[PDB]
């Protein structure tokens, strides 16, 4: 029940030993005649080994040993200020916290606390940098990104926290001004592309659910033909091979090669008499129309001139259903 110095300096297992306020009563004079370095060890063991549904209730615990002899030199104070760094760096992945970034920018991140305590602070992150920095590219505003990253880097220099919160972030950045804009394939052409950041982050693509119709179009319309190939296997590399991404692109390359090959050869009503036309793919890729049709409904009206009326008038109120989806 009650260890010497060196018994409770090499408990295997301290929390299940010492994570309650009756062990940490009984063992208030032996801890205390601990070295420093041996507390600070000690404290960060007990604090790791932790689970974070009983954090709270731990800290009650630290809360019932307390005594007005407890001063910034005891156990108690190196117990208290390591249950303060794992609860300020768990509390980023807390649901019930709705901006982890503001607590960041707040300086509720203090220099000296996580300087003394700096390897368990690393011990805390560990496993936790993919999470912690997919919720903050969640939840950062723009404005406050590159600010929210410099505090990571002055107090987790040369961390792979660090390095995996600045990935998390570039990825954001490009699906937001890139891959949502007007030119998505400079999302997959871009020098900064990285295939596992994308991976690794790759929740961070649900901001395009429901919008992966209109990405698909100016991707078939603004893409050079030697970046298709490469566009499409990045996206089957960080997308589920059935996501709605990729088959949308596909059939939205597809068409632009139905309309290149058939709609302005030789025959274009070839175009609209084959199993393969459906007003509702034309409609869902309007944009390619008003450019790859630019200065060509002459010659396609003069090659449509031998045909029966109601086909031709079909035709024309087809295409012109079409252009008005377009512009839209």
Same mark, same amino acid.
């Given at each position: 029940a009650t260890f010497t110095c060196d018994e409770l300096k090499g408990l295997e297992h301290?929390?299940?030993?010492?994570?309650?306020?009756?062990a940490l009563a009984e063992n208030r004079e032996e801890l205390n005649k601990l070295t420093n370095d041996a507390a600070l060890v000690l404290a960060s063991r007990?604090?790791?080994?932790?689970?974070?549904?009983?954090?709270?209730?731990?800290?009650?615990?630290?809360?019932?040993?307390?005594?007005?002899?407890?001063?910034?030199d005891t156990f108690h104070s190196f117990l208290f200020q390591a249950y303060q760094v794992k609860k300020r760096i768990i509390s980023l992945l807390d649901p019930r916290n709705i901006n982890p970034h503001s607590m960041i920018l707040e300086k509720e991140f203090d220099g000296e606390l996580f300087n003394?305590?700096?390897?368990?602070?690393?011990?805390?992150?560990?496993?936790?940098?993919?999470?912690?920095?997919?919720?903050?590219?969640?939840?950062?505003?723009?404005?406050?990104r590159s600010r929210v990253s410099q505090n990571i880097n002055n107090i987790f220099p040369q961390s792979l926290f660090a390095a995996k919160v600045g990935h998390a972030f570039a990825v954001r950045r490009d699906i937001e001004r890139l891959?949502?804009?007007?030119?998505?394939?400079?999302?997959?052409?871009?020098?900064?592309?990285?295939?596992?950041?994308?991976?690794?982050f790759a929740s961070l693509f649900n901001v395009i659910n429901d919008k992966e119709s209109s990405i698909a179009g100016k991707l078939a319309l603004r893409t050079p033909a030697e970046n298709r190939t490469d566009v499409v296997m990045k996206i089957k590399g960080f997308c589920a091979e059935d996501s709605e991404l990729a088959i949308k692109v596909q059939s939205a390359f597809a068409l632009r090669r139905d309309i290149e090959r058939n709609l302005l050869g030789d025959?274009?009503?070839?175009?609209?008499?084959?199993?393969?036309?459906?007003?509702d793919?034309?409609?869902?890729?309007?944009?390619?129309?008003?450019? /790859?049709?630019?200065?060509?409904?002459?010659? @396609?009206?003069? =090659? !449509?001139?031998? /045909?029966?009326?109601?086909?031709?008038?079909? @035709?024309?109120? =087809? !295409?012109?259903?079409?252009?008005?989806?377009?512009?839209?």
């Open positions: 301290p929390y299940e030993v010492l994570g309650n306020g009756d007990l604090v790791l080994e932790c689970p974070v549904n009983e954090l709270k209730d731990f800290a009650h615990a630290i809360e019932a040993a307390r005594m007005p002899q407890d001063d910034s003394n305590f700096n390897k368990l602070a690393i011990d805390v992150l560990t496993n936790n940098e993919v999470a912690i920095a997919l919720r903050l590219a969640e939840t950062t505003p723009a404005q406050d891959l949502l804009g007007d030119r998505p394939d400079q999302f997959f052409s871009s020098r900064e592309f990285k295939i596992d950041s994308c991976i690794e025959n274009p009503e070839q175009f609209f008499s084959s199993r393969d036309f459906s007003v793919l034309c409609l869902e890729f309007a944009i390619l129309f008003p450019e /790859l049709l630019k200065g060509h409904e002459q010659a @396609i009206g003069e =090659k !449509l001139a031998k /045909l029966d009326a109601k086909v031709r008038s079909d @035709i024309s109120r =087809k !295409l012109e259903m079409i252009n008005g989806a377009a512009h839209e």
